[PDB]
Design a protein around this ligand. Structure first.
Ligand code: HEC
Ligand code: HEC
Ligand code: HEC
Ligand code: HEC
Ligand code: HEC
Ligand code: HEC
Ligand code: HEC
Ligand code: ISW
Ligand code: ISW
Lengths: 49, 502, 502, 502, 49, 49
């Protein structure tokens, strides 16, 4: 009865909850090219709602 | 009315809580309790399975008949005398117990920590009077063999071959209406916002129904393996899994050990994670210092209790203790159940989190407790993510039809189960390459290792979500899934090269 | 007459129970006990292995010599005086033991639940008079360091470099003839109807013989690894594994924890399954309410013991308790041993099944006990069927010559082992592809997982034959075997095609 | 002078033990203790991670700030009154503590086994006088909330939003200079002859430093997973992991359960191995009999203790007990660390062996203890050999670049990690075929299975180096490594044939 | 010294101990074609000798 | 810092420490051709120093 949100997106969402949309956070789950993926709060809060 | 029973129960039972009597409440509770519609009987797959011999004690309302021998017509005193020889320790455990010593309870003085028992005795007499089982000024003299096993406060003789029953939850609830109603109230309080689980579930009120509505349970031929499942799922039917027959000691049900036989193992290792935490180890170290006879509400003051225990955390709600254990449930053990993780930030989950915080802050500051529960929620989701990645790979092979033996040797599971990818069935039934190895590896990754990582987190056992359970084993699953995926690709490649040459 | 020692032991010993004196019974027993043909010494593979330093303690009768220093010549009093310093706890533990306090025992009153010890003291004294170690008129003053470690009731000095021994079972049986005889009678009572196991096995009487008669133990180069096995297998030689030196407490030996160091682990998880059962959970919760000092015959009455324990189930036989633990044995742990499953319905098993019913019905009704024991038998057979299906596959591969490296890299096991399929040796020795992975998998499916399944069934731990041990892990083995089977077929079919084309 | 502190600690601090006052000793210890160059702060990889909410409790000196609410100013009594409602059990525990009842200790008589505590109280006071926290004629009144959480012996108001601290080791060591000094001295005693581990490691003094200087812990993105590692590595920062807040009972820190939350699990199963040995099972059976309140030095006399415990074995050194647990370490849990095995026969190891032998001879003869310690050393090397053989195989594959996905799907680990074979990071991070399955398997063989084998041997649990852990699991890993390797060689030959065919 | 009997046969035997030889029971072990295998009692009764 | 010496050579050293250089001892770890490998103490005391 809820839209599925992957666990990485939930985590990014929660990481951003106290934050401005232009703040950039580290992913809690993803590593690419030898570095933790950074995520922009605005882009993720957009993906959830 | 019953002061610790929820409004949503009175509502569901069409009762008005300002006017209902014990008799009325009991009768309404039982009417729901015995209705197949509401989960009694053999359930929807009743035609697929038959009871085994032990099934008469697991579900006595569906299966129990007394034995054909002895033929004995017996009075109260006879039960005790004959069983002093036939089942001697049952009699002795009974003699030692509160049920056989009610005048001791009558005589408890108000400076005794156990004083609340007199109030509970008087409440029980009130219930029975309302029910016409006891004279209004008649004291309950004892709860004896004949009372539980034939009829409460029985005056005359019983026929062994016809009148003997196994006492089920409605039988205990005749006297213990409060605890029975509290328990039954789980059907009404455990309602998910998006139907993540069926209403009333997970709960002790529906444990038996849950078990018999499990396809593989109904479908598998190995009945004796299946009945192991049933032995952890009988709370709905009988009240003695925590405080056991025939002492029925409340002190015993308060000890973490009382929950351990069911709440342990590969897919919910609460006993292991709790006992290994500092909480559990302090309970082990101080068990002999605490007074386990005091009620939960008095555990931390009169009981001298200084570390939490399964009952203290799970029976507590907003400052009171009840047999309803469902009201703070958020994650429900299995983090990958659809809608569970998405629900974690809802107002509904926040509300339950606040009730949790209130539990912890009996000892910790709120800032500390909220720091930890934040770690629990995000660590759970970190585990969920790692599994979700591994599952994408395997699920891809499935839809490709490329799992080992998927199209050559994958027989269907037993009826009424329907074939599918990484279903619960494949943990209790396998044949040929159903399931495939990767497929089983990924199911277990979620069912076992992710669920254990969550339980490690919730019960504050660091090794139980990092090295030893949860992350460590999930890492190996991931690694092995990746390895075999690649091995399987390079062999596919090589097979391709060969029918080219042909 | 030792009336708790079976006829078949006096027969085996060529004694008349009416006439034999304690001295004659002790000497006959000790003659058999110390005889190489009957299991003493290095056994039939003694040419393959040498003792290590710890071996002098594991098998003193073969290997012990006293140390070269201290050069000392000591009276009874000097042992205590010097060791107070040198091994202080041994003195402390001994000083607080019954051995050190025989007057306490002589003073027991007959209404004390411990009065029986006073009969046992006098029985010891009677034995010693018959052996000529005590005067007709002399009481046994104490059981001190010098008594056990040099000679019973020694009167003069001992030379520390020459006269000191490790007390073996025969040393204890000098005084404790009854218990020694009961334990030795396992040799005569444990006889299978069709040689399922060697006569007198499994038992504590022949545990060490069984160890040194195991090929891989004798053959493997890692002696310190092999000696871990020896550590679980020393009952034959020494009596202090359940009631340990130097307190020698009968109360300790009644506690489930006394059995757990040996009867635990991947191939017989008795401690684990029992402690997680309601039974063993209750024993944890009530250990402080039970009087462990009363004899097993009295545990349920005078001890207030209300849940069963290892010693109370396995030492009881037809209403009596003895150190013979073999008489009710039916499955003997490993359900795949040839002839065991098919003997499960014989008259012989059914009489043993009746003896078990007697045990359970001290507490449960007969109908309940038999319902459960029926589930244990059938659940074990269901386990067995499942492994049997798996072994068909892997066994076919071995005979077909198709295991991995079977033809190219399967070196032979160390002498005197012979090459075989799925043999006990492959659990303690591996080299190249001896064994192959699939072979070890299926060997482990039977030796470990099917065995734990059965232990879980027998000890009433539902998760220990369903999810966590037993069915779950066997399900995984079967699935991986089938999976590896199908893969290996696809690969040999693929290299048929590369062959065709060449 | 502090009689239990090693010369090398005074040397390291450039202090004269004959001369230094408590104040000076404290101040030198704290200067080192708080210095980044000596392990304090975020460590060398501090740029790669940020704290989560719970870290303010894990590393208070680096992260802790008081809460913004409540905005209140309080004196000593107000801490107790308000918290009596806001964190009620902390107030109840504290009231039960020695800390809150110093006059009791003061009134101890010299026939009381706890009498030593009054000497300790006077030592604390003298320490505080030297620091001028206490008048030279003032008695310490209590140790209350304000003392630990604000300032020792604080006479006036505290601002809740400014003056509240989490008590760290240096806070405790304000009064308990001896314990804190003995603890900090691990930095100076645990020095390896060939730098097998970094100076001062492993130890409780540097456990946090060790946690944060681990590449994967700094590099991985799953912060909540990584912080379960931090939970087991906080001793350096806070003194309440063995004797927990708010009771701070030394009796508690003496029980084996104190150590279990940390010293357990898949790569160091000391809890599991100890509890299952005879030593542990006796300690379980006998716990009710010992007086755990007596100091360790009196455990075996005044305490009644007759089986060994973690604290009694590991705090003991040459017949004395201190908080330094490093002085006898030889193997340090991981037998594969370069130089550890090679060092086992060194003079340095042999003096440390002699120290162990002394410990064991509290009870066993020297001969017995030396016999068993030889078996531990040699059994350890035999597991090490088995591992070394399996590693040669997979390690070859790595050099040949033939591991699955090695050249095709092996992404690099997160910064600041460097790609390599079988590195610790691959236990906590994985992506694609980094690591490969064989790689992880040989890694876990050493990390998990060889370490557990050594733990089992060191802790006298035979099943834990034979069947159940150590050898059996290593056996399986070896068998599956050989098996995969052969299959891979066969598939490599089959591929060679298919190029050649084209 | 005992003639080997498989566990599936021991079980079918067990369930057929007290039946007519034309009575039919479910297997405790076998699933074929999406269904637990049915056993005619006379047949496995005959398999034991 | 220390010259690495394999675990089986450490065992063989330990099994020879007290031996004459010409004495033979069993391996603690090696089986070849169905038999425990034998080692000459001179060969091993040599390898270590
Ligand atoms: C009336 C005929 C009763 C029936 C049927 C059952 N119980 Fe009871 N029990 C009864 C009374 C009056 C009391 C004393 C008041 C009190 O609650 O203490 C009890 C006591 C218990 C206890 C607590 C015993 C103790 O720890 O001191 C328990 C755990 C208990 N009773 C459980 C119980 C169960 C599970 C029943 C069904 C098998 C049951 N009782 C039947 C009265 C009656
Ligand atoms: C077996 C006879 C059990 C005993 C004894 C205890 N519990 Fe239990 N519990 C059991 C089952 C099979 C279930 C699930 C039922 C279902 O719907 O399938 C439960 C459920 C719980 C829950 C809720 C779980 C959730 O929401 O995920 C809780 C909080 C719970 N149980 C607690 C609990 C405690 C504290 C116990 C000892 C006092 C205890 N249970 C005993 C099985 C059994
Ligand atoms: C408080 C300090 C606890 C103690 C002691 C025990 N549990 Fe617990 N449990 C606790 C929390 C915070 C959670 C997660 C709550 C959430 O969903 O967010 C749990 C979870 C469970 C569950 C699942 C039901 C649920 O509430 O989610 C079960 C069945 C459960 N725990 C059982 C249990 C047992 C058997 C314990 C003793 C061995 C035990 N818990 C201790 C908090 C605490
Ligand atoms: C565990 C498998 C045991 C081994 C091996 C031995 N004994 Fe034992 N012993 C054991 C128990 C459980 C008991 C209590 C028996 C009861 O009915 O209560 C005992 C008791 C004895 C006694 C009696 C002492 C007393 O009760 O006062 C003696 C003298 C004794 N055991 C001696 C003994 C000897 C000589 C053994 C080697 C042949 C021996 N025991 C082994 C458990 C175990
Ligand atoms: C008294 C406080 C002890 C100390 C210090 C140590 N051990 Fe111990 N050990 C002790 C007892 C009371 C027992 C049980 C004796 C028995 O009857 O089994 C033991 C047991 C052992 C064993 C096993 C012996 C056996 O017969 O199976 C071993 C190998 C052993 N202990 C070794 C040992 C070592 C090496 C110690 C120092 C590190 C040590 N023990 C300390 C009592 C005490
Ligand atoms: C018979 C009831 C005994 C008495 C009296 C004493 N000891 Fe003992 N001892 C006994 C046994 C069964 C064993 C184990 C034998 C074996 O093969 O393992 C021992 C062993 C010892 C040892 C060596 C092993 C050890 O754990 O240290 C010592 C040093 C020892 N015993 C000392 C000792 C002393 C000083 C005693 C009088 C105070 C004493 N023993 C009494 C049996 C008996
Ligand atoms: C003073 C010196 C004494 C005296 C008077 C006795 N003993 Fe004991 N003993 C002594 C030492 C120093 C040792 C250690 C030897 C070593 O471990 O290397 C021992 C050892 C024992 C043992 C253990 C033997 C072993 O491990 O093989 C026993 C069982 C023992 N001693 C018994 C004993 C007895 C019976 C005595 C009086 C007859 C006695 N001792 C006197 C030191 C001293
Ligand atoms: C074996 C075939 C089993 C069946 C059919 C079965 N169980 Fe269980 N078990 C728990 C979880 C569940 C649920 C989900 C709840 C629901 O649907 O209402 C079902 C349907 C089910 N089991 C049936 C829990 C709760 C976990 C949690 O924390 O929420 C238990 C506790 C639990 C016990 C248990 C045991 C006791 C060892 C066994 C053998 C099984 N289960 C087997 C299994
Ligand atoms: C999780 C990613 C973890 C990290 C970064 C980490 N631990 Fe641990 N742990 C022990 C050993 C070590 C060492 C070696 C010592 C040193 O380098 O100075 C490091 C660097 C480390 N851990 C960091 C020991 C000691 C073993 C022994 O007997 O010597 C422990 C005890 C121990 C505990 C532990 C826990 C407690 C459950 C957890 C979750 C981890 N560690 C995780 C791991």
């Amino acid at each position: 009865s809820l839209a599925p949100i992957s666990a990485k997106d939930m985590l990014d969402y929660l990481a951003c909850k106290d934050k401005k949309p232009t703040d950039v956070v580290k992913s809690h789950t993803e590593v690419e090219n030898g570095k933790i993926v950074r995520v922009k709060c605005g882009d993720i809060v957009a993906l959830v709602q | 009315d019953i002061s610790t029973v929820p409004d949503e129960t009175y509502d569901a039972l069409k009762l008005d809580r300002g006017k209902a009597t014990p008799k009325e409440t009991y009768e309404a509770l039982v009417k729901r309790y015995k209705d197949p519609a509401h989960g009694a009987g053999k359930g929807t797959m009743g035609d697929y399975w038959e009871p085994i011999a032990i099934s008469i004690y697991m579900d006595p309302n569906t299966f129990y008949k007394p034995p054909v021998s002895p033929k004995e017509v017996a009075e109260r005193k006879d039960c005790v005398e004959c069983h002093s020889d036939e089942t001697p320790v049952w009699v002795r455990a009974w003699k030692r117990s509160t049920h056989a010593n009610l005048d001791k309870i009558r005589n408890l003085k108000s400076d005794d920590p156990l004083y609340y028992k007199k109030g509970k005795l008087e409440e029980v007499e009130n219930n029975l009077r309302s029910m016409g089982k006891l004279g209004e000024k008649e004291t309950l003299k004892e709860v004896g063999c004949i009372d539980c096993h034939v009829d409460v406060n029985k005056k005359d003789k019983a026929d062994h071959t016809k009148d003997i029953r196994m006492p089920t939850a409605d039988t205990c609830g005749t006297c213990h209406l409060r605890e029975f109603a509290e328990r039954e109230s789980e059907r009404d309080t455990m309602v998910w916002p998006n139907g993540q689980w069926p209403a009333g579930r997970p709960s002790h009120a529906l444990d038996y129904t849950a078990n018999i509505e499990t396809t593989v349970w109904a479908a598998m031929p190995q009945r004796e393996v299946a009945e192991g499942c049933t032995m952890c799922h009988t709370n709905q039917n009988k009240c003695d899994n925590c405080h056991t027959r025939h002492e029925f000691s409340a002190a015993e049900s308060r000890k973490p050990e009382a929950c351990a036989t069911c709440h342990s193992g590969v897919d919910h290792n609460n006993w292991e994670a709790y006992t290994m935490s500092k909480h559990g180890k302090l309970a082990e170290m101080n068990r002999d210092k605490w007074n386990w006879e005091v009620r939960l509400k008095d555990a931390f003051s009169k009981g001298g209790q200084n570390a939490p225990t399964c009952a203290a955390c799970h029976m507590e709600y907003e400052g009171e203790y009840t047999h309803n254990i469902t009201r703070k449930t958020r994650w429900a053990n299995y983090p990958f159940v659809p809608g569970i993780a998405e629900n974690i930030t809802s107002d509904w989950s926040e509300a339950r989190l606040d009730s949790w915080v209130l539990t912890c802050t009996q000892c910790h500051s709120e800032r500390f407790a909220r720091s930890y529960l934040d770690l629990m929620d995000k660590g759970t989701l970190e585990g969920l993510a790692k599994y979700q990645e591994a599952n994408a790979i395997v699920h891809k092979m499935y839809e490709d039809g490329t799992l080992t033996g998927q199209k050559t040797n994958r027989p269907n599971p037993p009826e009424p189960e329907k074939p599918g990818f990484g279903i619960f069935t494949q943990l209790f039934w396998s044949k040929g390459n159903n399931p495939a190895s990767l497929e089983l590896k990924v199911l277990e990754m979620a069912e076992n290792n992710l669920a254990k990582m969550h339980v490690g987190l919730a019960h504050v056992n660091p090794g139980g979500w990092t090295y030893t359970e949860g992350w460590g084993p999930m890492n190996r699953a991931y690694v092995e899934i990746q390895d075999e995926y690649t091995k399987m690709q390079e062999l596919s490649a090589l097979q391709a090269r060969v029918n080219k040459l042909e």
